[PDB]
Structure 1
Amino acid sequence: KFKLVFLGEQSVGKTSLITRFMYDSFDNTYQATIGIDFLSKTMYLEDRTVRLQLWDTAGQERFRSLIPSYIRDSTVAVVVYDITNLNSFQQTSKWIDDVRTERGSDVIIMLVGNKTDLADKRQITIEEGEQRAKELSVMFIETSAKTGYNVKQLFRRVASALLE
């Protein structure tokens, strides 16, 4: 049950993160997700292999009613925000709240501050994200689907958490 569901407001980088991990590519052009896609891939870690299942959800508000079914079903929830967007960060509380209401203590949550490459328009410090994650008892990491920074680390840490 290495099932990961990506949650987060529109345009924070959920699809880009999944695509960077899956095919190690990045398209700077925006193409909104209008359904729910799933992919899978086998990765290596801690002297073994693990089969991951990834769910990419639509962040636009008109698709929110389609998301609960996927949360109930996943063992890991990756809540993503955009470090250049204050609202996207504030909204992570809603997503984390939703996940815990549906999964309780039986879930691994990773808070992700994406788009670190956009340093000049950063609105949330890495320390504020790390502090929020600690206060809410969830994992934390910053990434850049564009440069690929920490993308493999994100999945490695989530997979490691599952194994433990």
Structure 2
Amino acid sequence: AYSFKVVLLGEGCVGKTSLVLRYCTTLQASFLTKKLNIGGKRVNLAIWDTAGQERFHALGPIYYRDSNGAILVYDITDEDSFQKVKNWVKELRKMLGNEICLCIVGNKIDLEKERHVSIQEAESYAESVGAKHYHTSAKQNKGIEELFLDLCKRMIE
């Protein structure tokens, strides 16, 4: 019954593509789908990748329109990538419609030795904007399933 649009945010270098490929010969990784069953309820998930480069900054809203959820990926070793998430959240929160369900995803937790964004800053930021924070490692296939499962739960609620 439920059909959900989920936008994916981040530059290529934060490893967003590996993350969604993990979850979902592949021709393209820009539009991706999953059919899910949650509490005997059927869920159609569509993942809409959005161009993360600075030159495309004004285009976000066109992509974000009518989203049900958003997955904002940053690289835990790159504080600039986290700063980008905070600006994206501001945009997502100005979208006309219902509250988009936000995930703030700290990727490459396999490089925790080299992390620049503290767990406390990331989780406290997420709470402040009504988002949820997740740790993932596309490299080691951790946290990916939990993220998408939880988001759908949240989008149903």
TM-score (normalised: structure 2): 0.88
Match of 2:15 among 13, 18, 28: 13
In the TM superposition, residue 44 of structure 1 has moved relative to its aligned partner by: 3.1
SS of the residue corresponding to residue 84 of structure 1 reads coil
Question: Are positions 1:2 and 2:1 aligned together?
Answer: no
Does the 8 Å contact 1:8/1:95 carry over to 2?
Answer: no
Cα separation, 2, equivalents of 1:157 and 1:12: 21
Q: Which runs of 5+ in 2 are unaligned?
A: none
After TM superposition, list the pairs within 5 Å mapping 1:6-85 onto structure 2.
Answer: 6-22=8-24, 37-85=30-78
RMSD: 2.2
Cα separation, 2, equivalents of 1:104 and 1:95: 17
Question: Are positions 1:110 and 2:110 aligned together?
Answer: no
Question: Are positions 1:146 and 2:139 aligned together?
Answer: yes
TM-score (normalised: structure 1): 0.84
Moved over 3 A (4+): none
Aligned match of 1:29:
none
Cα separation, 1, equivalents of 2:9 and 2:96: 14
Structure 1 stretch displaced more, 151-160 or 98-107 = 98-107
Does the 8 Å contact 1:126/1:142 carry over to 2?
Answer: no
* Percent identity for Structure 1 against Structure 2: 41
Cα separation, 2, equivalents of 1:122 and 1:131: 17
In the TM superposition, residue 154 of structure 1 has moved relative to its aligned partner by: 0.4
SS of the residue corresponding to residue 130 of structure 2 reads coil
In structure 2, relative to structure 1, the CA distance for the partners of 1:48 and 1:104 (3 Å cut) is: closer
Does the 8 Å contact 2:78/2:116 carry over to 1?
Answer: yes
